[PDB]
Amino acid sequence: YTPKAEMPPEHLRKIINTHSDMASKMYNTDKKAFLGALKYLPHAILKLLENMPHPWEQAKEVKVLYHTSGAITFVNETPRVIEPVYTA
Amino acid sequence: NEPPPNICEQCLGDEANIRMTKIPQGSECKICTLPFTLYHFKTSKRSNNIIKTLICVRCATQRNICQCCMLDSRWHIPIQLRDHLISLVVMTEEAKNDMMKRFLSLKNVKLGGAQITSDPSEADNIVDKLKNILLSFFLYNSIPEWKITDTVSQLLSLIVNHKAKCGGLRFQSSELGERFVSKIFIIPWSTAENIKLSLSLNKLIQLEL
């Protein structure tokens, strides 16, 4: 159906920052979420690694999904290239 | 396979459409501490606070109660009270133990009384039987302070010991007291003999410990 809302990165950043000193009864469930996320952390790693900016690239912008709890963040895009161009 | 949720009329709401979500093995039942499907409904769309089911269907069946209200399915009375009434015309003993409670839950006997409530025959009969059965100032001379306070208010800090039976009301205003006197169980300022004696005895009792 209707596509995902392109959120601002700022929001994501804020979320991340909140779950640094996480030790209240607030986000009990966020800790649970985090724990769960281990399941997909290797996937996330694979994604991020795959998106590694190549040496002809100062800094790559990349698509990102992230759990609103702040538990996990997947680089979403899969980096495809024009093969000959890539080789060059 | 799953049985259906047993939610009462007053529990659920006053409307001809309610939407609820089922959460299979959501929480453990409070009685039995055994996984079961949580139903939770919002009553009216916008009216705040959800109504989650707190007990497993089996347990509800056993007690014959609303899965939210924890009250008799029929008469909408706390389990104790409903059972007590039946007894008056035997009550349930929920076994408060880690292992045993679960076992009890799984048993399907309708614990105690529940059977009577379930059947039109039996509940009705019980009801009938019940019907038949039915058919500043110190203060001296047991009843609660919330009643005393109410009385005082009507007449218009309020200390009362019961072992003493000696209620020292302190309005802290000469207006309130002088209104209180005119608008009107011994009531002085800051079988009479018998009463005095009793009071004295009470005082003594209070003072020996």
Place this chain on the structure above:
Amino acid sequence: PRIKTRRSKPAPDGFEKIKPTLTDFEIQLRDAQKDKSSKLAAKSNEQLWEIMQLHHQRSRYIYTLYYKRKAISKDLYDWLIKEKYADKLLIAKWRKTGYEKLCCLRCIQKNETNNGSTCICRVPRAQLEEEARKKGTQVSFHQCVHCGCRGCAST
């Protein structure tokens, strides 16, 4: 915004005029993006809401200057869009009918919500208020949990 890496040309013509307006925003964002030890769920949510609002606001400003006021070149607008400054989808939504006052896109993702519908914010205050009146109770909701949006509707 993203970081400049000599990918796109520094900026088109009229950026110097608007830059100081949307650079105030950056400061605000920076204040937002950090550990406000909220110690409380509602409080925590509030910062997120604030952030969202800020994000919206910049876009609105940009949108307003390009469409309504029309005081900025098309090229510049395009450049802005390409950069992270504006939100493109949001802008598009705004441009469409019935979505002009629009807190955020994820308040109209019908898939997301538990009940298959839009956010309440999208209900015009009028209707909710009327319902409340009919019922007996007062105005029922204040702001949604996605973004702080007291009466987002186009009315």
Place this chain on the structure above:
Amino acid sequence: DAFQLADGIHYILNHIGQLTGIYRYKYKVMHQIRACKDLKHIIYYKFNKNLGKGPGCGFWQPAWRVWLNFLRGTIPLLERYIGNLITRQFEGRSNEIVKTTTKQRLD
């Protein structure tokens, strides 16, 4: 520097083996490590033909690719493993059944 960064990356990818113990815990990463080493050998010989021996060879690509492919395999294994562990932590097994196909306990 950019060149330096590239070189660093290359080093990491070749030296996964030394840099950090994966191989300890799963010793089929050893194959991957070997492959990386081979690539380095090949790549370095191609790259330092007229040019002499030293550090500063970039060209991390094939190594990177290899690591990515290794990760693919892990994704599954980790999802069973890590996921299982987390499940246990939340809901920790009832009545396991031992298995006599083991050399021990058979007799």
Place this chain on the structure above:
RNA sequence: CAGCUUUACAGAUCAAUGGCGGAGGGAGGUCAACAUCAAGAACUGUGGGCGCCUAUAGAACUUAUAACGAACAUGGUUCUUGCCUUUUACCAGAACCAUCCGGGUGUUGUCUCCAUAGAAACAGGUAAAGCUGUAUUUUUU
């Protein structure tokens, strides 16, 4: 420089017949949902003849140093090996199997960005595009 077929054109009688007609989008998203992609070189229906012949047709994708990948991981099971002597974690081969990281194609649905006409051919011209042409024995002198 002739001929016929189509557009761009007036003003037509507008029958006659055709063709564009229940005449209304296009470009795209690191956007979805579904279908389907290893089988007798292998496809799908349609009737008819009676699970199979004969005409209709359609057919997007993938394949011959055989495959959705000019790409390559990991599992599980047996069997054999090797380091070994306990197992995991491993060696390397085999056979079945799975998982995974991906890929198309088709159909919808959406999201975005640009846009808005409900009627024209005939008699033949005006102009431009498609093809053919350049009487003395076998075609028409």
Place this chain on the structure above:
RNA sequence: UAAGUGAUCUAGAAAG
């Protein structure tokens, strides 16, 4: 009158 080209296993961690 003719020697002397190439084939190169491995590869560690836990618990016991």
